[PDB]
Amino acid sequence: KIEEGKLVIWINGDKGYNGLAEVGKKFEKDTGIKVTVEHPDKLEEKFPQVAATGDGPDIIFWAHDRFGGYAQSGLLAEITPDKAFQDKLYPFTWDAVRYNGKLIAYPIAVEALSLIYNKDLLPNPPKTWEEIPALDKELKAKGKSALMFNLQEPYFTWPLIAADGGYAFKYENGKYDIKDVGVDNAGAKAGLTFLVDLIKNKHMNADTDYSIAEAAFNKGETAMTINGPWAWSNIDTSKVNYGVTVLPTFKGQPSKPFVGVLSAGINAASPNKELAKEFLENYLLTDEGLEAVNKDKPLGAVALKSYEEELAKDPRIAATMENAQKGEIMPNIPQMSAFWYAVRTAVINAASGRQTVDEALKDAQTRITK
């Protein structure tokens, strides 16, 4: 039971606060409803504290992965965006926020991975995964390494398997297959095989993580680095020209790194569903509101086509959104998240040498089909 007549909004992201806060003010100005915007980071540890007591915000934002636990806990209220919004919602992302064949959530922001590399040093990046350890090899004798993936965590080992195209990479005439299981493919096995073998070959480091790479970036321990665009904010400490290319190679043909679409829900414990309703439909999912939020967050973030139509004007973002279709949208489905975690444990058991690639993806398969 959340207090009536109030709108508490737990925003989720690096910034975006002022943008959404100003939108919250506009809501309060027109409705008279007191709006409180905040960002209690570490929801993984903090959210449960209010979730288990029937408390929390009225509106709350989650990552494509983290959201699955939000709906799983049963704190997600039914959400029905304006019919026009559902039309402006692309099938790729509109289905991504469904569950049990029902629309349960709405997207707010779109992010994707990539291959960030030192362009000044090597303007020609690895064309494929076989050319990743090629640069680790050249630096191997130099006491350095090109690849700086988080390998202690499954962050950059899960998509390593998926990158090959044998796992979590489907397409059917404007649709995606998230019912099949990819870990049983040799392509999926190859990705995990690459991990383990290249660790033994002293090109990859299972110990390397965010904090190690971050320190390496600030200290300048290596001549170059290969990592995602999320780590680029730490990579660019060197103040040199870093370039970007396609990280994954899908059946021998690269296209576009996987696209993680952030989404938000409404607290079931909120009696203020009408306040979240009006805010959502009138403000949050309005081009003006999306622009306000993207005042602090990257402009690439988009909820509706109606805003993507304005992003089409941007030579760079338009091309990104076009190429985004060449990848796959990550659904916020609770079951899909659990299916990913099945592999996220497999990649670590194999990296640590607890079990083989076959055994690792065997256990993953079982967990996915469970």
Side-chain angles (χ1 to χ4, degrees), residues 1-229 231-370:
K1 182 178 184 180
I2 294 168
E3 285 177 355
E4 295 179 357
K6 294 182 182 179
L7 185 63
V8 178
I9 301 171
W10 283 10
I11 194 169
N12 189 336
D14 288 347
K15 302 182 179 178
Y17 180 83
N18 286 338
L20 187 59
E22 289 301 311
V23 171
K25 289 178 186 176
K26 289 177 181 175
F27 182 81
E28 176 166 347
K29 285 177 182 179
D30 293 309
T31 64
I33 301 300
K34 184 175 178 175
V35 179
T36 300
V37 179
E38 56 184 355
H39 189 320
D41 201 4
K42 304 186 182 185
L43 290 174
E44 291 176 359
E45 297 178 359
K46 292 182 187 164
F47 177 72
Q49 292 177 359
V50 303
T53 60
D55 293 342
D58 303 70
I59 299 169
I60 186 166
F61 298 73
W62 295 95
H64 68 94
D65 184 55
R66 287 170 169 152
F67 185 88
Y70 178 71
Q72 181 179 5
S73 67
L75 264 69
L76 175 64
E78 184 178 358
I79 300 169
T80 55
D82 192 293
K83 181 177 178 180
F85 294 176
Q86 293 183 31
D87 287 347
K88 289 295 184 187
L89 284 173
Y90 282 104
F92 295 4
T93 62
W94 184 76
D95 284 344
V97 293
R98 295 170 71 199
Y99 182 56
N100 290 333
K102 295 181 181 181
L103 188 66
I104 62 166
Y106 62 94
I108 195 73
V110 179
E111 295 186 2
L113 298 179
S114 68
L115 197 166
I116 304 301
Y117 69 95
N118 184 338
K119 184 173 181 177
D120 281 345
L121 186 67
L122 294 174
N124 185 341
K127 292 180 179 180
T128 190
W129 287 105
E130 292 176 358
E131 296 185 8
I132 294 290
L135 299 182
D136 287 341
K137 181 179 178 183
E138 291 301 308
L139 296 175
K140 182 171 175 174
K142 301 298 180 183
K144 300 181 273 295
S145 177
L147 188 66
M148 296 299 291
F149 277 179
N150 186 340
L151 301 177
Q152 183 63 49
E153 297 180 298
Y155 188 6
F156 285 108
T157 60
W158 177 86
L160 174 60
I161 291 171
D164 286 348
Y167 168 65
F169 188 69
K170 300 289 186 179
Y171 189 74
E172 181 177 0
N173 295 332
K175 300 176 181 183
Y176 290 89
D177 179 348
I178 60 170
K179 295 181 184 174
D180 205 358
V181 180
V183 306
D184 65 0
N185 294 306
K189 291 184 181 194
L192 189 54
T193 297
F194 295 165
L195 179 63
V196 172
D197 285 350
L198 294 181
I199 291 167
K200 290 181 179 179
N201 289 333
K202 302 182 183 182
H203 302 303
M204 297 175 87
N205 180 16
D207 295 309
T208 298
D209 66 17
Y210 171 83
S211 66
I212 292 169
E214 183 178 60
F217 299 159
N218 288 339
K219 291 179 180 182
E221 290 301 307
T222 62
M224 65 176 292
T225 179
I226 300 172
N227 215 336
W232 200 352
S233 65
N234 297 330
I235 290 169
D236 65 2
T237 298
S238 296
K239 300 184 183 181
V240 300
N241 188 336
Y242 292 99
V244 59
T245 190
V246 177
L247 175 60
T249 301
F250 297 108
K251 301 184 184 179
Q253 174 67 59
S255 69
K256 182 79 182 170
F258 291 103
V259 179
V261 177
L262 278 57
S263 64
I266 298 171
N267 194 341
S270 170
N272 298 318
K273 71 183 175 73
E274 294 303 304
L275 266 30
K277 176 180 168 69
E278 292 301 303
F279 178 81
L280 177 59
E281 294 171 3
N282 297 330
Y283 295 86
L284 184 58
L285 295 179
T286 299
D287 288 348
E288 181 179 358
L290 291 173
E291 182 70 15
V293 172
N294 287 340
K295 184 177 178 183
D296 302 304
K297 286 184 167 187
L299 292 171
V302 58
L304 302 176
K305 176 174 177 55
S306 66
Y307 187 78
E308 183 265 338
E309 289 164 3
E310 293 301 306
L311 294 179
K313 292 174 178 172
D314 188 302
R316 296 177 179 182
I317 293 169
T320 298
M321 290 300 294
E322 182 178 359
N323 288 338
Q325 292 179 1
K326 297 173 179 169
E328 171 165 343
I329 301 299
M330 297 292 99
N332 68 3
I333 294 169
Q335 293 179 23
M336 287 299 296
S337 180
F339 297 168
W340 298 341
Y341 282 117
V343 177
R344 287 180 180 175
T345 60
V347 292
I348 302 303
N349 289 346
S352 66
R354 283 191 289 270
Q355 58 192 164
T356 66
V357 171
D358 286 344
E359 289 165 349
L361 297 178
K362 179 179 178 183
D363 286 349
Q365 183 180 4
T366 298
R367 289 175 180 175
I368 292 168
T369 60
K370 182 177 179 179

